[PDB]
């Protein structure tokens, strides 16, 4: 009972007809007309599981089905037998209906709906089901779907529970007047325009009702942007809901106002109330006149906001322009009536706005808010003065963790719109021989050969064995020759491909040798190894050469800068096309266009049409988007030219869309759509989101990383995905892991928050630079030196380190890579050091990762020293054109300095790979990781500054030669090095430091030696000094509770310094009197007052007999820094210092009854006396007592025992060998002479009256003697 093999379509989703009668291919969907004299028609049939099939019609008739005229249609094909009504036929035929009347009603089709609204602007419109907006052509340059400015009087979705339209590239109405439209929502929105773009419409001139509307998706135009309407004109809009990605990178010079609901709020009768929104809103303000209010903004003409709550975030590029979370410009172009400003009520946003204000962009004494609420997000904006600095405006009403309770003030959540159309697959049985076990196999082998009699399809299935992996679910397989991912059937059809990769739902494949066992011109079939099954790649082997001869010339003549290409591109003439960075790949794609277009229509469509007229449709289909085809294939080529081992993915994504299922999708069309998608979508950075718009739902895939993750299982399985990532990119990356086994084991964990894995960390969510994975992947050469370290990700330019002494080729590469390993060792040792200190379970935040970007000052090899070049954009720097620029990270870039946004670090004065830049790396780490990192989960002192925590409190010594009490955790240096002389700093950290408890021992001793010498100093002084010698020896310190602009309260005490009076000096007659007069040496200090959060540090041996502890909550800088240094030297950093510098007793202070209002919020205030007691309630009731007991304890400590083994030069260049100071009295006797000589004939002018001064020489003489004498500062007795 042998059947025959004939062409047969099994998944016949629908049949469509087009005619070339007018010289253009046009769809005769209905009212086709009585059969035409000439069969110029060609039948394209759509299949849910296969690409559309094509053939010319051979017969067409019109007969009455039940006295019901229906245009019969027939098609002649080589062997298209149809099992019609369980009866086999020879060639496919169908019957097309006469007409439909679902356009008078706009309920059914989007195309019908747009026509209906255009015949009558004023009408009542209703929707039957959720529908696709893809039905519309979109027009070459049409402004919006509806031309009419007055429309949509009553458009409603209430008839059904809910409905929405998905896939929108244009605004809906373009303008509304007296129009009520509610219950209407959209999903795959992507509206981009060079005009004032509003998602719903451009404007609402009269009162128009916009309610219970829930738009979501992408919105971004070159010129203007409003959340729903571009501007609000006397129109009621409330309970609205736009949650989408909106950005206006284009540097338009107009003062465009963008808004969450309307860019300009202009209605007096109008008002926005109880509305919701979320956004990745960002922009370059530049102009104060331009205003982004986050929630609508540009409040003007008496517009009132009724309890609206939005959760979207702002990332503004320009600090100068005005932008804020709830109001962008309260001020009016008209007169400043408290009333024309508009009103704000019950408003809270969790915007992490940058370079923008928290609540209102324009602050005026008559602010019209009165109901202010804000969330805990980032509002810090960069001042951009000489030094680059970033701070919050601190002029907003802050709220705590009851933001969810505040969210409950919002009345509604959302609606769940019914899903769009389905047109299900409906995936055979009822055959002469059917095996139920082989049913899945029949489905799996239906993929392997299409257009085969269902009987023949099952015949092949019978040949399958029980062991065959076809029994396991088999995803779409693919054919490749020597791992070339061959797509060209017309060329390698004669050629025999090495193997067929049988993809599984396991996400693994199997290899079967192919051979051209049989050749059919209708279809080419191959051998299935020894198993004996057959295999045909799906194609009709039509005459492509004729198409090839005509297509290449017209597409060949195109220009990257061509105005027509720009006209088809979604870009204005003024904007520079730099962002594409596609000019290099524009040239390459054109050079390879013939092979590129060969690989394109090789599998584009199913054509059984020997007739050449049908082939012309394909040629017409291509030229139409020739400009976009070039741009698209160029775009895809630029971003998909990386191989998994030996297999380029370019073929995998560019062609073979079926390999990951959804083979029915049109591969040629996904390219033309991706070319017209618009430069907003094609923007380099937009690749991630463009994976959502184009590469998701066409490949039936969810995430770019997910497809790439799905791809390691398919290619090079048994090799880690991060391993595929690490091996493949040209850039040098290094993931040095910490010595601690538990953290090293965590560095092993591919799981997020523990993995050192760069691929994982870039792929990780909450990483803004996840889009940096494509540009890194396609990097031409090692122009990118990269590092990975605990809770961090290093990134740098070889060209930045390029200069004379560092030749661009090999020599520069060698110094850069070696330096990267050295710095990687320096960074990871500092973090391992910080881990030993951090045992408070704050290791839950141990691996927070932030970027380390370089200056981008990419210098020549010719340049003698570091380059000062901005290298802003469009440079020949391979590093800039292939990386950093594609993942655009615009920065303030100072001529000098290194700043951080709190989520990243930046280097200009220093270099990330510079050894001195390491100290700056910790300085930025002090600025960022502190809030709850170095602190125990309590915010820094209320006044204690952000840069007051590093200059002295917590930073590496700027140099070993530099003298300041500090921890040298960052720098480890050898003992044999000449730097051993005057090292003054820890030679090796992490070895003496194995725990915070060991640090406490290290500083008690370090400060015992400091405490020993300071008393040796004062005694000599209080005892033997001339009255005039006493005047120059000392200084007095005071505290000023001055008004500060940020806080209305003036309670912040500020250390100010001045010379003590002659009468004040006569009074001092005791060492205690120095403690009582609070006067400290003026040797290393000047009377210029110290500004709060100013750069003040602790000199290594400057005597401080002052304990000026403010009854006020904040004390100042040096006193605050100094007393915290002795608090570490007494109590553990967590035990004492953290309480004194984390305002953790604020709740205790409220219990005490001390309070300060902050950000218009009644808040607690914490005082030195209050913390003096918490730390030491009964041990000492005064700071003076605490320091006094430190001293007498200290007196016995030096007196009972001190080593004799202290020998020092402290003499001129001629080396002095051994002081051998046996006892403290001998040291004091020597001290009396050295200080007396220091006070005799003092220059106290010019520079360095300290390192040159005898007292400091002697102070660092016996200090260095101790440092040399003891392996570590472990015990002095």
């Amino acid at each position, epitope marked *: 009972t042998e059947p025959e093999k004939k062409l047969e379509l099994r998944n016949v989703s629908d049949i469509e007809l087009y005619s070339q009668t007018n010289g253009t291919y046009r769809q005769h969907v209905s009212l086709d007309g009585i059969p035409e004299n000439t069969d110029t028609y060609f039948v394209k049939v759509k299949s849910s599981a296969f690409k559309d099939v094509y053939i010319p019609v051979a017969s067409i008739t019109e007969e009455k089905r039940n006295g019901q005229s229906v245009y019969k249609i027939t098609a002649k094909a080589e062997k298209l037998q149809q099992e019609l009504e369980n009866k086999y036929v020879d060639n496919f035929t169908f019957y097309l209906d006469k007409k439909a009347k679902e356009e008078n009603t706009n309920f059914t089709s989007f195309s019908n709906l747009v026509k209906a609204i255009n015949q009558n602007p004023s009408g009542t419109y209703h929707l039957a089901a959720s529908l696709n907006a893809n039905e519309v052509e979109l027009g070459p340059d049409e402004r919006s779907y509806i031309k009419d400015t007055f429309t949509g009087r009553l458009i409603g979705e209430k008839d059904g529970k809910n409905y929405a339209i998905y896939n929108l590239k244009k605004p809906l109405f373009e303008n509304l007047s007296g129009a009520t439209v509610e219950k209407l929502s959209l999903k795959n929105v992507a509206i981009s325009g060079k005009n004032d773009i509003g998602s719903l419409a451009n404007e609402a001139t009269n009162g128009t009702k916009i309610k219970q509307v829930h738009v979501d998706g992408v919105l971004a135009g070159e010129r203007g942007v409003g959340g729903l309407l571009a501007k609000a004109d006397q129109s009621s809009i409330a309970e609205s809901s736009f949650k989408g990605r909106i950005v206006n990178t284009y*540097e338009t*010079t*107009d*003062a465009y106002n963008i808004g969450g609901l309307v860019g300009h709020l202009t209605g007096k009768n109008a008002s926005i109330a109880k509305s919701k929104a979320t956004v990745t809103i960002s922009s370059n303000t*530049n*102009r*104060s*006149d331009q205003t982004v209010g986050g929630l609508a903004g540009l409040v003007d003409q008496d517009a009132h906001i009724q309890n609206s709550y939005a959760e979207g975030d702002i990332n503004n590029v*320009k*600090h*100068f*322009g*005005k932008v804020a979370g709830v109001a962008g*410009y309260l*001020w009016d172009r008209t007169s*400043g009536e408290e009333k024309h400003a508009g009103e704000l009520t019950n408003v809270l946003s969790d915007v992490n706005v940058t370079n923008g204000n928290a609540i209102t962009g*324009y602050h005026y004494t008559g602010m019209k808010v009165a109901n202010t609420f804000s969330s805990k997000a980032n509002r810090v*904006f960069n001042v951009t003065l000489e030094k680059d600095e970033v701070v919050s405006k601190e002029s907003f009403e802050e709220r705590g963790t009851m933001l969810d309770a505040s969210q409950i003030v919002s009345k509604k959540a959302e609606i769940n719109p019914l899903t769009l159309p389905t047109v299900e697959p409906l995936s055979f049985s009822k055959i002469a021989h059917y095996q139920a076990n082989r049913a899945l196999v029949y489905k799996n082998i239906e993929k392997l050969l299409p257009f085969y009699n269902k009987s023949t399809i099952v015949k092949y299935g019978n040949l399958v064995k029980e062991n065959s992996l076809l029994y396991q679910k088999e995803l779409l397989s693919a054919v490749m020759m020597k791992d070339d991912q061959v797509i060209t059937d017309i060329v390698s059809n004669k050629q025999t491909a090495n193997k067929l990769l049988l993809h599984y739902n396991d996400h693994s494949s199997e290899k079967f040798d192919l051979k051209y066992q049989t050749d059919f011109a209708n279809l080419a079939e191959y051998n299935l190894g020894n198993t004996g099954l057959l295999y045909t790649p799906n194609q009709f082997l039509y005459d492509r050469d004729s198409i090839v001869k005509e297509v290449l010339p017209e597409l060949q003549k195109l220009d990257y800068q061509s105005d027509a290409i720009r006209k088809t591109l979604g870009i*204005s*003439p*003024e904007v520079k096309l730099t962002e594409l960075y596609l000019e290099d790949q524009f040239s390459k794609t054109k050079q390879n266009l013939g092979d590129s277009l060969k690989k394109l229509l090789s599998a584009d469509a199913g054509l059984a049409s020997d007739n050449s007229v049908t082939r012309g449709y394909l040629v017409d289909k291509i030229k139409n988007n020739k400009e976009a085809l070039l741009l698209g294939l160029t775009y895809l080529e630029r971003w998909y030219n990386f191989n998994y081992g030996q297999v380029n993915v370019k073929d995998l994504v560019m062609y073979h869309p079926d390999f990951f299922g959804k083979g029915n999708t049109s591969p040629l069309d996904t390219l033309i759509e991706l070319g017209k998608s618009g430069f907003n979508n094609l923007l380099a950075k937009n690749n991630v989101d463009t994976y959502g718009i184009s590469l998701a739902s066409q490949h039936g895939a969810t995430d770019l990383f997910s497809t790439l993750e799905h791809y390691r299982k398919v290619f090079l399985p048994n090799t880690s995905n991060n391993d595929w990532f690490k091996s493949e990119t040209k850039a040098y990356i290094v993931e040095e892991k910490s010595t601690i086994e538990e953290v090293k084991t965590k560095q092993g964990l591919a799981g997020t928050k523990y993995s050192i894995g760069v691929y994982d960390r870039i792929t990780s969510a909450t990483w803004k630079y996840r889009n940096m994975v494509l540009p890194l992947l396609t990097l031409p050469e090692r122009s990118v030196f990269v590092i990975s370290t605990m809770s961090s990700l290093g990134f740098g330019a070889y060209d930045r380190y390029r200069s004379s002494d560092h030749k661009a080729g090999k020599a520069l590469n060698d110094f850069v890579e070696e330096n990267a390993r050295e710095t990687a060792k320096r960074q990871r040792d500092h973090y391992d050091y910080w881990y030993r200190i951090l045992d408070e379970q704050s290791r839950e935040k141990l691996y927070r990762t932030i970027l380390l970007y370089d200056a981008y000052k990419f210098g020549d090899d010719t340049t003698s020293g570091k380059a000062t070049a901005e290298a802003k954009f469009d440079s020949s720097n391979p590093a800039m054109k292939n990386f950093f620029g594609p993942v655009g990270n615009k920065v303030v870039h100072n001529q000098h300095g290194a700043y951080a946004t709190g989520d990243g670090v930046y280097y200009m004065s220093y270099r990330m790979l510079d050894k001195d830049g390491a100290i700056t790396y910790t300085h930025e780490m002090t600025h960022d990781s502190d809030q709850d990192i170095y602190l125990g989960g309590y915010g820094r002192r209320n006044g204690l500054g952000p840069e007051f925590f590093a200059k002295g409190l917590l930073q590496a010594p700027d140099q070993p030669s530099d003298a300041t009490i500090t921890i040298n955790s960052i720098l480890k240096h050898s003992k044999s090095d000449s730097t051993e002389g005057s090292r003054l700093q820890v030679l090796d950290p992490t070895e003496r430091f194995q725990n915070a408890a060991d640090l406490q021992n290290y500083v008690h001793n370090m400060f015992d030696l400091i405490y020993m010498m300071e008393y040796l100093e004062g005694q000599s002084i209080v005892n033997k000094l001339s009255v005039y010698q006493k005047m120059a020896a000392l200084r007095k310190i005071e505290n000023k509770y001055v008004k500060d602009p940020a806080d209305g309260n003036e309670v912040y005490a500020t250390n100010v310094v001045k010379e003590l009076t002659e009468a004040e000096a006569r009074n001092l007659n005791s060492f205690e009197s120095l403690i009582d007069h609070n006067i400290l040496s003026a040797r290393e200090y000047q009377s210029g007052d110290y500004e709060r959060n100013g750069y003040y540090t602790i000199k290594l041996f400057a005597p401080i007999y002052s304990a000026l502890s403010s009854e006020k909550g904040t004390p100042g800088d040096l006193m605050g820094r100094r007393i915290a240094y002795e608090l570490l030297a007494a109590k553990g950093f967590k035990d004492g210092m953290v309480p004194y510098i984390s305002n953790q007793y604020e709740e205790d202070a409220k219990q005490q009854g001390q309070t300060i209002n902050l950000y218009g919020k009644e808040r607690g205030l914490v005082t030195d006396e209050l913390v003096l007691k918490k730390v030491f309630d009964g041990k000492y009731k005064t700071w003076a007592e605490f320091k006094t007991a430190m001293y007498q304890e200290r007196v016995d400590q030096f007196g009972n025992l001190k080593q004799v083994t202290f020998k020092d030069p402290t003499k001129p260049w001629p080396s002095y060998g051994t002081k051998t100071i046996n006892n403290v009295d001998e040291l004091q006797a020597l001290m009396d002479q050295a200080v007396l000589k220091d006070a005799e004939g003092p220059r106290w002018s010019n520079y360095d009256p300290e390192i040159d001064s005898a007292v400091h020489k002697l102070k660092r003489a016996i200090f260095k003697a101790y440092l040399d004498q003891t392996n570590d500062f472990r015990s002095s007795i």
Partner: antibody
Amino acid sequence: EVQLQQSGPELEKPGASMKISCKASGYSFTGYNMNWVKQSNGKSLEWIGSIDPYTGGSNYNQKFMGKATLTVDKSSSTAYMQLKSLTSEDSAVYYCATVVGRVYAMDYWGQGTSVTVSS
Amino acid sequence: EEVLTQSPAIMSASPGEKVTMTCSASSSVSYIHWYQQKSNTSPKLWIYATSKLASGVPGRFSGSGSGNSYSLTISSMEAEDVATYYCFQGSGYPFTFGSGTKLEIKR
């Protein structure tokens, strides 16, 4: 109406530095962006730098990069054009501008400051 | 940088005559902003956005342009018309002024 009053005409010696100032009225000084131009008798008139008053923003021409910088005083509603390394070439009338609808002029331009430089 | 090239630098025309100036840029910008200036006086805008006329201007003054080719077209010449002109542009940074053209009477 908005009226702009630049500093009085001044003369300075070359290789020196001077600061001029434009006064503001009848408009939101801070809300409309300011601008500055140099008026050469020998050559046409040429823009130096636009200034944002509310946030003290400053955009500089490549020609005047570092030569001069822009400051502002919101309270006094009066901007400040800061000039350094003054040269005989710098000698000129100056003019503050107010940006409305993307356009610096006619509204508004100050009476003019006849800055001169001399030894 | 975008240059602006007004010509002729000086034009002599009898009252009622047709006078036009030609300015060409180094780049293409959507809008151009004209600017009349009297001799030794602060100048004022006379046209903007290529064709959008400024306030307090007579109807005779007109403007047109596209690509790198721009111009101002005044239908009739008057004594008040005798002034400098600049098609200043601010559409692209840095903002730049026209090369400079001044109307003159033909006497």
